[PDB]
Write a protein that binds this ligand. Structure first.
Ligand SMILES: *[C@@H]1O[C@H](CO)[C@@H](O)[C@H](O)[C@H]1NC(C)=O
Ligand code: ALF
Ligand SMILES: [K+]
Ligand SMILES: [K+]
Lengths: 986, 288
């Protein structure tokens, strides 16, 4: 694993290092011996834990720490029930129900934490199976896995490179470094030193980049995981982001609620033993304490809110591999973003036309025929001729039902943008190419720099000769005499001379590749239709042409990316660009799409404007910065943070796939949640490290798409703004659900806390609590998940990763100390009423549990002096249990209505507008009706049928709870930030 | 803690006063409302009549030995063996001495044959307390007769006392003379006795329980309807409820006998869930 490459050294100099001959190759002996020490030529696949271990790892899933202790103590009490016999026993039944719910919530949390580390799927397609190696002066083709550092290979045209290779002979070689840069712009390779660093030294190939054309002999410098794709793969699979920022909040949340459970468990266990209770009694007290505090269904339902909105996001073309990913978007702070494929259409198309010394703009998106094509009407009429005639590119077949721009083309990146432009403008360019038949053909060369063709215009009568030459703009004025303006061919002048270069310099300064066009109608006197033009450049003239027009191509932004980036930035999110493309194109892409504002000038712009040295001007006055990948090598992590902090519109260009992770980790060390949007193999390692990665669906490499957490199926970068919206909404509605379950837990806990201290008969059985958490509130608990925010989230900035959390001490003390205690007071009113109607007054219930639980005593006296049988007292105790359980859910109908809104009145959100909260309200009433006041509670489960008046004893406290809540929400609306908004807001 | 803007423990002093005052008023009001709602609940209940009598609607029945686990096992040779048993009887029966039923202001003499249920009062705050019917010990013949091995309470071949659980406003109605109740009665007196006939639970067991003799008022094997109804402890002081002794002179020793003593009435019911509602369950073994 060395990135200390060796391209400076000459052929004679490397051959002494790697112990090879450039022409005799390597002996197969030393092939074996070197293969021994270095290893085979293969990427070692990643290590994925077996699913059985991950499943059973989800059995300590936070709450399962306390529920294991719960079922332990249950069966321990049953062990002591072997010592003393108890026929009708619920400690085996309760221990069983608890382990059932540990395994229950475990299997849900198993799907929720998902990890697709299927990275090698994509790498195998690109890796080559065979190599043209030469050992011991014998040409043999062997498998690429057998190569070793410093055996000669013959790269061929059209085949993948067998290893990281340093070329030493090359004849018109051109290779595809899009696996490192993300552009299929072929970089041609020489056999000599071009650049200092080995990323583009023009003399080294790269592992499994495709060889577009030519033949080159090379010697392998690195093979295996030390290769550049090997290193990309090591970072994409090895740096597997298991950390997620959604579940850091709910992990901390189970830390606090288990914290309060444990602390009050030991508080009341020591005050149990101080009350001269046998440890057996006090541990049954602990079983009830932990079943009261633990929000049983909370985590289980959460993954159902999450996967619900996962599949709903996936019906809007936002595929969410990991259920967590739906929140990770939004509450994010910095978007590092690839350009091509992601911010870019990744189709070279034309954008600006300069004719008649006048500038024009064209259709860039999938749109068609958008331009002022009607100005000269005579200069552009012949300009269309030269555009369509001077191209060798062709459309692939079977394209009658597929959009023009969205079409398959065979040919050059430059030529094909003109094929597309002529095809949106003129219907069928093949018709007019074929009509204006091309009689004379010219070869093209890399040194050539221009392309020319002679066509016999099939005008009915004219049938003259037309020559059409396109090429680099530098050559055009060199070989042009008469310009054309509105049909008339006016000679050039001194004005247009410099005018051409000044316009061209400013056009190319926007990252647009410029191509100039000239033609000339040859007289019929000198060359009639019989005269033929010999290809060896004897029969035709190469100077004194007629300049037609000029144009440029840019690879334009996607149709929607500008506006979607406007909305992200306007929702408090800093946008950074990270791509492999040269910073001339990058700054123009960046200022176009809303990444750089128009009055923000980099140090380049200001130094150019003032005409002063860039060393002289300082740094802060330029709000936007363009940092090349080359100056990030010498950059120190402290100053990467310096610049990330100083300027807010920063773009990184010609940047290595490892500098993508470098920059993303640089953001994240600033307490910033990150979302990297990518399409290519170069993005994949920095797509794993992000808190969330976002991949392009059709226009994204597989390697990024397996590293992602959201795959955008329609390459619509407009799903980010709505994905932020729903992520911030899901976070707020998780706050609502959570506090809703927390406030109940107190009114479940206060009965046992009084029954230990005061001796009143158990107000609700520990087994009946589970019916609350597991049955009545699962539909209410999911119905809060459909709520809408009181105020627009976009008008507000993202959440700070650490500063504001999912559960804060204000929500915790509101749920526990405010609404839990109002609920439990309401439940105890129903308790005392259901005892005081059968004779047992409030006052004369203290210390009774002891005699109450005594079964030898069938004549207990009540306050009216009647005598009571044990079983009658036990049925009444059960009616106390159901009275208390029904009371709390009745105040849970009110709890659900207050928890729908954390900011303003129920009138503003509207009690009727959410249908699902009414399904929850109804679900709550109907389950209690199915339970207590009906079948399934006649003899069973600590359940008795209830007097109809006992249901409504808990409407006073459940109007009170809503009123009090509503009043503080009114006051936080009224006086914001003046100790009511600070101390009384969820 | 920043000396810059106070903010000890997050908060300045003035806001400390604000938050404690808010929580004192929050909880003080919250407690005011809870005890307030309790008081408005307690207004509805009368100190004199239970709002509902749903649970105690079937009257229960309990043995006066107050036996630990439905069981009476002793040795007529060992005094301690039955010591707690006879002590519990004496403790209960202390109240029924003519000694205790002495004041004619609170105790009236009710007939020595069963009478019509004495409707004394209506449950109002008027006329003060109510006079309770006397029950003399002698009617517990051979068991707390005050003599004739009374003190033993049948140390050999034991004796229990059957008592019907007090229910307020309850005038029990004995079953009508439709058919033979049990064995040829020749003891009708239907209107004014709740028949209480101890029987052998185990049918297959050839009821080795032996002789079973009940000692009631005037020799009637039930509760005299005169005492009923019950006006509550506040209205009736130390209301002496009717009591029925039962001699069990069994011909089977060192063998555990299970017996179930049932109250027969049309107004009395019994349930299989409540083995002390309308019924008994006594396991007596007279070990040697
Ligand atoms: C039980 O009482 C009757 C009353 O006439 C008496 O004759 C009988 O002897 C008594 N039983 C015993 C064992 O004294
Ligand atoms: F802009 Al890219 F890979 F798509 F750097
Ligand atoms: K709970
Ligand atoms: K990721």
């Amino acid at each position: 694993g060395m990135d200390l490459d060796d391209h400076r050294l000459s052929n004679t100099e490397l051959e002494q290092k790697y112990g090879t001959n450039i022409i005799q190759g390597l002996s197969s002996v030393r092939a074996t011996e070197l293969l021994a020490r270095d290893g085979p030529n293969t990427l070692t696949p990643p290590k994925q834990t077996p699913e059985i271990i991950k499943f059973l790892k989800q059995m300590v899933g936070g709450f399962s720490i306390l529920l294991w202790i719960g079922a332990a103590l249950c069966w321990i009490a049953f062990v002591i029930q072997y010592v003393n016999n108890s026929a009708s026993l619920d400690n085996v039944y309760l221990g069983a129900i608890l382990v059932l719910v540990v395994i229950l919530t475990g299997i849900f949390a198993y799907y929720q934490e998902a990890k697709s580390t299927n990275i090698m799927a994509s790498f195998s397609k690109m890796i080559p199976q065979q190599a043209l190696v030469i050992r011991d002066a014998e040409k043999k083709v062997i498998s690429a896995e057998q190569l070793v550092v410093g055996d000669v290979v013959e790269i061929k045209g059209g085949d993948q490179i067998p290893a990281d290779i340093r070329l030493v002979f090359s004849q018109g070689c051109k290779v595809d470094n899009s696996s490192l840069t993300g552009e299929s712009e072929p970089q041609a390779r020489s056999t000599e030193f071009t650049h200092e660093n080995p990323l583009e030294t023009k003399n080294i190939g790269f592992y499994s980049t495709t060889c577009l054309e030519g033949t080159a002999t090379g010697i392998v410098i690195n093979t295996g995981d030390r290769t550049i794709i090997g290193r990309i793969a090591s970072l994409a699979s090895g740096v597997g982001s298991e950390k997620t920022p959604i579940a850091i909040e709910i992990e901390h949340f189970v830390h606090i609620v288990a914290g309060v459970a444990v602390s009050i468990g030991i508080i009341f266990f020591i005050t149990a033993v101080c009350m001269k209770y046998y440890v057996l009694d006090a541990i049954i007290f602990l079983i009830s304490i932990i079943v009261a505090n633990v929000p049983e269904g909370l985590l289980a339902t959460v993954t159902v809110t999450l996967s619900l909105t996962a599949k709903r996001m996936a019906k809007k073309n936002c595929l969410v591999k990991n259920l967590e990913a739906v929140e990770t978007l939004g509450s994010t702070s910095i978007i590092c973003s690839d350009k091509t494929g992601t911010l870019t259409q990744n189709r070279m198309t034309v954008a600006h036309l300069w004719f008649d010394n006048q500038i024009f703009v064209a259709d860039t998106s999938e749109n068609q025929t958008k331009q002022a094509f009607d100005q000269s009407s005579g200069t552009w009429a012949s300009l269309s001729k030269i555009i369509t005639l001077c191209n060798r590119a062709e459309f692939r077949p079977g394209q009658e039902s597929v959009p023009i721009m969205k079409r398959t083309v065979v040919g050059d990146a430059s030529e094909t943008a003109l094929l597309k432009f002529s095809e949106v403008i003129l219907g069928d360019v093949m018709g007019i190419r074929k009509r204006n038949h091309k009689v004379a053909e010219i070869p093209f060369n890399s040194t050539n720099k221009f392309q020319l063709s002679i066509h016999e215009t099939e005008d009915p009568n004219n049938k003259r000769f037309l020559v059409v030459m396109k090429g680099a703009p530098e050559r055009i004025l060199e070989k042009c005499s008469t310009i054309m303006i509105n049909g008339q061919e006016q000679p050039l002048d001194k004005s247009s001379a410099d005018s051409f270069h000044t316009a061209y310099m400013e056009l190319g300064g926007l990252g647009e590749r410029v191509l100039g066009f000239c033609h000339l109608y040859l007289p019929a006197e000198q060359f009639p239709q019989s005269y033929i033009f010999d290809v060896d450049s004897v029969n035709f003239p190469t100077s004194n042409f007629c300049f037609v027009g000029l144009l440029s191509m840019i690879d334009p932004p996607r149709s929607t990316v500008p506006d979607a980036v406007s909305k992200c930035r306007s929702a408090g999110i800093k946008v950074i660009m990270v791509t492999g493309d040269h910073p001339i194109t990058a700054k123009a892409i960046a200022k176009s799409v809303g990444i750089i504002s128009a009055n923000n000038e980099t140090v380049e712009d200001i130094a150019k404007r003032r005409n002063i040295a860039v060393e002289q001007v300082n740094k802060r006055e330029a709000k936007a910065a363009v940092v090349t990948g080359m100056e990030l090598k010498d950059m120190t992590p402290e100053q990467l943070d310096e610049l990330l902090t100083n300027y807010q519109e920063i773009v990184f260009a010609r940047t290595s796939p490892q500098q993508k992770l470098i920059i993303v980790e640089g953001c994240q060390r600033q307490d910033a949640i990150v979302a990297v949007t990518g399409d290519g193999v170069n993005d994949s390692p920095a797509l794993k490290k992000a808190d969330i990665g976002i991949a392009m669906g059709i226009a994204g490499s597989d390697a990024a798409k397996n590293a992602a957490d959201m795959v955008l199926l329609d390459d619509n970068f407009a799903s980010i703004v709505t994905g932020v919206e729903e992520g911030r909404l899901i976070f707020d509605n998780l706050k609502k659900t959570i506090a809703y379950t927390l406030t109940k837990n107190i009114a479940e806990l206060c009965p046992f806390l009084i029954y230990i201290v005061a001796g009143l008969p158990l107000p609700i059985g520990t087994i009946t609590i589970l019916f609350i958490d597991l049955g009545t509130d699962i539909i209410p608990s999911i119905a809060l998940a459909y709520e809408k925010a009181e105020s627009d989230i976009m008008n507000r900035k993202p959440r700070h990763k650490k500063k504001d959390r999912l559960v804060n001490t204000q929500l915790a003390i509101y749920s526990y100390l405010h609404i839990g205690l109002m609920q439990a007071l309401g439940g105890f009113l129903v308790y005392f009423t259901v005892y005081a109607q059968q004779g047992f007054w409030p006052t004369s219930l203290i210390n009774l549990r002891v005699a109450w639980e005594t079964d030898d005593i069938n004549d207990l006296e009540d306050s009216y002096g009647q005598e009571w049988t044990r079983y009658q007292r036990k049925y009444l105790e059960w009616t106390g249990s159901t009275a208390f359980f029904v009371a709390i859910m009745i105040q849970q109908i009110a709890d659900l209505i207050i928890r729908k809104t954390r900011r303003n009145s129920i009138f503003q959100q509207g009690l009727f507008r959410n249908k699902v909260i009414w399904v929850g309200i109804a679900s709550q009433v109907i389950v209690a009706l199915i339970l207590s006041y009906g079948l399934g509670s006649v003899p069973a489960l600590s359940f008795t049928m209830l007097r109809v008046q006992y249901w409504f004893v808990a409407v006073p406290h459940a109007i009170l709870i809503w009123v009090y809540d509503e009043m503080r929400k009114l006051f936080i609306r009224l006086y914001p930030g003046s100790w009511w908004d600070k101390n009384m807001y969820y | 803690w920043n000396s810059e803007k106070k903010e000890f423990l997050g908060r300045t002093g003035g806001s400390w006063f604000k938050i404690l005052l808010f929580y004192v008023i929050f909880y003080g009001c919250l407690a005011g409302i809870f005890i307030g709602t309790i008081q408005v609940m307690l207004l509805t209940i009368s100190e004199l009549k239970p709002t509902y009598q749903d649970r105690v609607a079937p009257p229960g029945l309990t043995q006066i030995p107050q036996i630990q686990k439905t069981e009476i096992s002793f040795r007529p040779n060992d005094p301690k063996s039955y010591e707690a048993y006879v002590l519990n009887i004496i403790r209960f029966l202390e109240k029924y001495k003519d000694s205790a039923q002495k004041d004619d202001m609170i105790f009236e003499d009710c007939g020595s044959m069963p009478s019509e249920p004495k409707e004394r009062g209506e449950f109002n705050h008027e006329r003060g307390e109510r006079k309770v019917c006397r029950f003399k010990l002698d009617w517990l013949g051979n068991c707390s007769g005050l003599n004739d091995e009374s003190y033993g309470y049948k140390e050999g071949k034991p004796c229990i006392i059957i008592k019907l659980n007090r229910v307020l406003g309850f005038k029990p109605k004995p079953p009508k003379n439709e058919s033979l109740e049990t064995y040829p009665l020749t003891m009708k007196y239907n209107p004014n006795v709740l028949p209480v006939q101890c029987t052998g639970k185990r049918d297959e067991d050839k009821d080795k329980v032996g002789n079973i003799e009940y000692f009631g008022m005037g020799g009637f094997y039930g509760f005299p309807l005169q005492y009923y109804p019950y006006y509550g402890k506040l209205l009736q002081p130390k209301y002496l409820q009717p009591l029925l002794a039962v001699q069990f002179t069994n011909l089977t020793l060192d063998t555990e006998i299970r017996i179930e003593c049932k109250a027969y009435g049309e107004n009395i019911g019994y349930s299989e869930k409540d083995r002390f509602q309308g019924r008994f369950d006594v396991k007596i073994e007279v070990k040697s």
